[PDB]
């Protein structure tokens, strides 16, 4: 029954690779208890087992994906707080090996395990959603160093950007690092931070060029040189997007690429651009092409905002702004209902003779919406600011207004009630709405900053990983890198960090981490022996033992 | 004083977000509507300056909505133009998708005057609540330094 | 004054500097009839600084 | 005068802290554990009876 024998029978009659590998030393009993969910057995097996990092890490991958495959709430819960405590005492296991030997922990990370399937601890963490592991300061520093690989991770930012702008500045006293030519050149141009800087510069250049083409050089005439090079740049952008979707099993890659909604908005942006180019090239849909290109500028620019998120002083708050969307939905719904109400009330009280469908639709939503932001048509709504006349043949006072779209012929019979309704609208919308909104913004912002930061840690990690996977060249000249990588696929027809670790240095590191892990076992051994509750317990079994001993000597 | 000195990161944050969103909307507007005064300074003004005052009650509705302008053939290019009564909004604007123009203006007003400013309000409230004690102690120290110079 | 909260500020109706001086009343004072429709046909200006 | 004054006050401060860690709850559990296992030891010294 449960999740052991049914899965074993499935495997016999037949993360999934793990189940196939397993069939019916300390690692062996370890994984046996982890599949069997023997909690105490498992912690013992791990504690006295090898590869303690790496292995609490593999077992926590299995625990997390298992609790994700668990159809029962209780086993999922016990499995997941097992994962929580294993990951926690592992992250401070990593902290105690880190505060002991920086470089030794660093080379512990990028180690190949003959275990669960040759996934480095980082991959184990990402697949296990080990956000605690990622937020751990040690691995945070390592990922910072990798993002600044060979780039003197303590170098100032301004020096780095000046170096990027001045290629001769690389051979100076500034911007130190870890043929000195060519090699220094390649390291600089392949460092992930330099890749990001070049990509940002390219995107800014593209948005400048596209704005310039849209504003001044988009006549109905056939496209000019600027528009043609814009088309070429966008073709390069489309190519890089499709190639990174194809790179980071073709169907599986596509399906996983439909995720990462950032990528989704980038794809919708490029599909919009293709339709815009089609409309431009067809003579008829020229104005429509202009409009669609204009609305496409929106998606490019908003994509740049998510592109710029990596900044440490900016990233947590950019993650924050992504959590207010439900709030703006709430306030949108409430403004909409109250607004359509007040508008219908206004055009019910006052009767314009311009009872046209577009005029009514404008007057009922658009104008009252602008009444919130200081655009109040007081001289168009109040009888006291506007001149009387015999405008309409219907019996009653009308007083033609001076407005252009407020209706050519308004009614004034209950205009006092109209004024009172306007006062009520201004009281409710301009005061209650926005203010309760900003109060609940303050609340929702105060409840989400911490898990936004911890999430941003992993988000930044993912960005660093994918940018390390990105090709070196810039989108303007990414045609050379595309011909290279296509040739890396086209000169394949005729034909992620992975730093190597030494033999018996593996033994040194294992024993070192084994020594450190047994020190951490014995350290929390003193910690629990000195804990207040356990010392009360200890005094209890020293005083109940004492009373038992008195009972043993009671017959005296 | 220490707090208003410390809020500088937050004001930077709001500045960057406002800048990116305003350049977006300004370029979109100048693309969707085509004045015949497409001079470099005129475009530079219309794209940042005016949309900046769009946040503070200075809405050129009579300069951007078709329902408030008068129709005329102020340009030779086929299509309705309806020259505006403004001074620097161009001499001959375009109205082809003025419904979309109004919709984009509404989207701008929704994003700018609600989302960004109020999120920044929450940002100040948080950063004021989290550093006030450190500000007080640093003020003790700075006051001591100040009386030392005096 | 309720519209004064929401940006509707009749400055040209309220400040002497923005309204043209005229003898719109027989009372011995300075009036400067304002151009507002319901701001009063003839207002006073003795303590308009106040 | 000031030296001896501040020294007297410092030794009163040390005695205040020494006694404060003599009614603190954690150290009182510590001293009670010391008393109880000393009692265990001394009962061990009389077990041969
Ligand atoms: C970060 C960037 C992409 C944001 C977009 C800003 C763009 C739309 C702004 C910045 C500078 C502006 C340019 C200023 C001067 C000129 C020269 C003129 O003969 C054509 C228009 C053109 C080219 C303007 C078009 C709009 C413009 C390019
Ligand atoms: C609070 C929110 C929902 C306000 C929404 C404002 C909308 C509804 C306003 C703003 C501009 C207005 C539009 C202006 C122009 C047109 C083009 C016409 O051919 C159909 C009516 C239509 C489409 C109007 C309908 C109402 C309108 C779309
Ligand atoms: O880009 C986004 C979200 O983008 C949008 C959301 C809603 C409306 C939009 C309207 C226009 C353009 C983009 C929009 N990214 C993410 C969102 C979430 Cl909830 C988690 C992670 C990410 C991520 O990128 O990692």
Residue numbers in the entry:
A (entry chain C): 470 to 483, 503 to 512, 558 to 711, 766 to 835, 851 to 1097, 1108 to 1168
B (entry chain D): 920 to 1069
C (entry chain A): 970 to 1019
D (entry chain D): 1120 to 1168
From the article:
Transient receptor potential (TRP) melastatin 4 (TRPM4) protein is a calcium-activated monovalent cation channel associated with various genetic and cardiovascular disorders. Genetic defects in TRPM4 are found in patients with inherited cardiac conduction disorders. We determine three cryo-EM structures of full-length human TRPM4 embedded in native lipid nanodiscs without inhibitor, bound to NBA, and an anthranilic acid derivative, IBA.
The anthranilic acid derivative NBA is a potent and specific TRPM4 inhibitor, but its binding site in TRPM4 has been unknown, although this information is crucial for drug development targeting TRPM4. Analysis of the HsTRPM4IBA and HsTRPM4NBA structures revealed discrete densities for the IBA and NBA molecules located at the periphery of the inner membrane leaflet in the pocket formed between S3 and S4 helices, S4-S5 linker, and TRP helix. The additional ring of the naphthalene substituent of NBA was an important fiducial marker for the overall placement of the ligands in the density maps. In both HsTRPM4IBA and HsTRPM4NBA structures, the hydrophilic anthranilic acid moiety containing acidic, amide, and chloride groups faces towards the cytosol interacting with charged amino acid side chains from TRPM4. Notably, the anthranilic acid moiety interacts with His908 from the S4 helix, Tyr1057, Gln1061, and Arg1064 from the TRP helix, as well as with Ser924 from the S4-S5 linker, and Ser863 from the S3 helix in both structures. Our structures show that the naphthalene substituent and the 3-iodophenyl ring of NBA and IBA bind into a hydrophobic pocket between the S3 and S4 helices of TRPM4, making hydrophobic interactions with the residues that decorate this pocket, including Val901, Val904 and Leu907. Compared to wildtype HsTRPM4, NBA dose-effect curves on single variants of the HsTRPM4 channel show a drastic increase (up to one log of difference) of the IC50s for the NBA, suggesting a decreased efficiency of inhibition by NBA. Compared to the wildtype construct, but also to single amino acid variant Ser863Ala and Ser924Ala, a more pronounced decrease in the efficiency of NBA of up to two logs of difference is observed in the presence of the double mutation Ser863Ala/ Ser924Ala. Based on our results and these previous studies, we propose that the binding of NBA or IBA to TRPM4 may restrict the movement of the TRP helix, maintaining the TRPM4 channel pore in a closed state even in the presence of activation stimuli.
